[PDB]
Symmetry: D2
Subunit: 223 residues, 4 copies
């Protein structure tokens, strides 16, 4: 079996925010068929991070999403060869982050090679002045274009003093081998930083994702 | 006492697309607590419509949304005074539609006053060429900003050749009277043109909506 | 067909955040000198609760100084005329859609204008009327799929010295088939020279000259 | 001085594929002209349109009259940095940064470039771009730093244009006086290149102005 019920994660992120480079490495594990995962992240270079850690969390794997068999699982199909994705995150105040992830499989551990580059974050904004609290739960929209899978969702960070700071996500998912393409569908996400020290040198990060097909006659009419 | 399990709708939309004016009137009904509604629309002016009818359906009332006790219902609370909304629909090929709706209540019947204006639709695009089929199901996202309720959601129209045509929705909801504001929440929507004549002069439109709080 | 001295007559009907208004204007200009002026009067919806500056660019490319160097799409379109559609996307989410159907009767261009703006926040510079003037700008014109397009990032200066940006997307459609120009620019300068307290009366000026970029 | 030297190193990736480029150049800052030769050291042959990098390959090479405060010439010898997002109309996005220092008469650039979501069938990946049209960048002050905004366009082979929205932030390393709202006309040209663009000779010309003026030309 290519995907086991308990798999491991190893990653290294190299990047920059507003021109200032940094590097972070992480080790984790998750349940691909339950859509749950967790990891411990450590800042290796550029610490203490001068920006909101929240802008990186969604960059720190689609295979960790619970897909019903009614909907084709593009990502679980892509293994053992793996897949890659590119993402642009356009925040409403002009800050923009571009990120890439090359995902491979080694035994039962997923390996990420991540690049992250954010620019145009204003000094007085919530990212530079580290005013974010958490990502709100979100519903990602998946669709096929040019034979690859695309991901579109407008996200929102809850802010310190209340209110929300929005970000437009545009993701392209590319399997390394030929796989079957899914129909238009959704994936609900919930990402949470469970623990951290002051300068976010150590971060414990949790993610939970479930695919669905939108407003249904639902299945909860007993049995 | 204000909203009954069965209410009615009467509406008139006046607008233009790429400078060509049109007018549409509709009558319908729905169940606010079940989040379902239906209506029959008719083209009164500007027919036959030279653009895809689907760009108007989401303009043809969140009061017809199933709200759990979990979430404050901004819209049902806004009556009998009613509420209004403004919306911008930014399609990925540059077409932009601006819409407003002034919603009042007369007895058991909702009255909509709708204005609709779309521009910069290219002649070879799916809207002017009428290549759309149905809005994909969507999850509308609602949040508070500067004391008013806002709606942000990237929608998608499925196209005839199987492709998809995306649109960014930005809605502002304003209650006529001071109403308690809800927390961050969602509303799943499913809208369908169930029946129509050849020229879309007659359209029977159904919508179904249920609010929720995202992945728990 | 186009005389050195022409006149302008227009009526704008529209709404901002759902509140309707109507404005009528009469003006004068010199198409070959790229200058024009007009007096506008609010007929309905006054006093206007929004910044008047968001309407001035909607209140005619034919009033642009074109060299021999560049094909003049707009002067060619007459006597049949042309129309245009425009979206104006302000950086705080406010967006205005406008159309203008321009015809010619004798010396006078006749505009039929529709204007609709939504999602302007109550605390923003438009609803608070904190705008001063449009900065002069360079509009880029190009052909796409047989139509002439108008693209430019504008900016309104604010009372406290700040700037409020807006992205213009314009489509120009001649009533009859004309020859399309190549990629070029049009510099703009638009000014409200005079007005009454609530902008019931506005005197507006515009100056435009086409060019083909850094030589 | 009227004649300066340029040294740069660009490291980056497009759609996840890394590449590296080095360049040496020279220009006339007070005349708003500059030239350089660029060489690919890693990631060649480049699988994307070279035109997306040229505008990343220094506003100090812009002719500013005494009419307008020169934010960029003021920032030296300490130098300045800039960040830029380039939003192409088909979804492709490039983020770029440049840290500019001065060693004698030679400018040294530390450049990072990252582009994503370029479609396989688009003009960047299919390499169907010709050149950037001349443009007019508009510069203004926000939160004490200088901003650059301009919607630009690339011509394609079979005719037509492929648009890109530039948003640039310029940050001087020392305290300098801030300019008023103004413009800078720009024209960028690849004067020569070999088949796989592994070597490129690149020219740029820039002049600042204040918009439609009583015009001085008389």
């Amino acid at each position: 079996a290519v995907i086991k019920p308990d798999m491991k994660i190893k990653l290294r992120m190299e990047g920059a925010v507003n021109g200032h480079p940094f590097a972070i490495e992480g080790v984790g594990l998750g349940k691909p068929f339950e859509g749950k995962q967790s990891m411990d992240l450590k800042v290796k270079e550029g610490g203490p991070l001068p920006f909101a850690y929240d802008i990186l969390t969604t960059v720190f794997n689609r295979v960790f999403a619970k897909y019903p068999e009614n909907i084709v699982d593009y990502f679980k199909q892509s293994f053992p060869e793996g897949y890659s994705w590119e993402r642009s995150m356009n925040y409403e105040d002009g800050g923009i982050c571009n990120a890439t992830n090359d995902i491979t499989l080694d035994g039962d551990c997923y390996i990420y090679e991540i690049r992250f580059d954010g620019v145009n974050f204003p000094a007085n904004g919530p990212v530079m002045q580290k005013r974010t609290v958490k990502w709100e739960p979100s519903t990602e929209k998946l669709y096929v274009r040019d034979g690859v899978l695309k991901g579109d969702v407008n996200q929102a960070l809850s802010l310190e003093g209340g209110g929300h700071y929005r970000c437009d996500f545009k993701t392209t998912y590319k399997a390394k081998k030929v796989v079957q393409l899914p129909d238009y569908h959704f994936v609900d996400h919930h990402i949470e930083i469970k623990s951290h020290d002051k300068d976010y040198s150590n971060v414990n990060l949790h993610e939970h994702a479930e695919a669905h097909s939108g407003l249904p006659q639902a299945m909860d009419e007993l049995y």
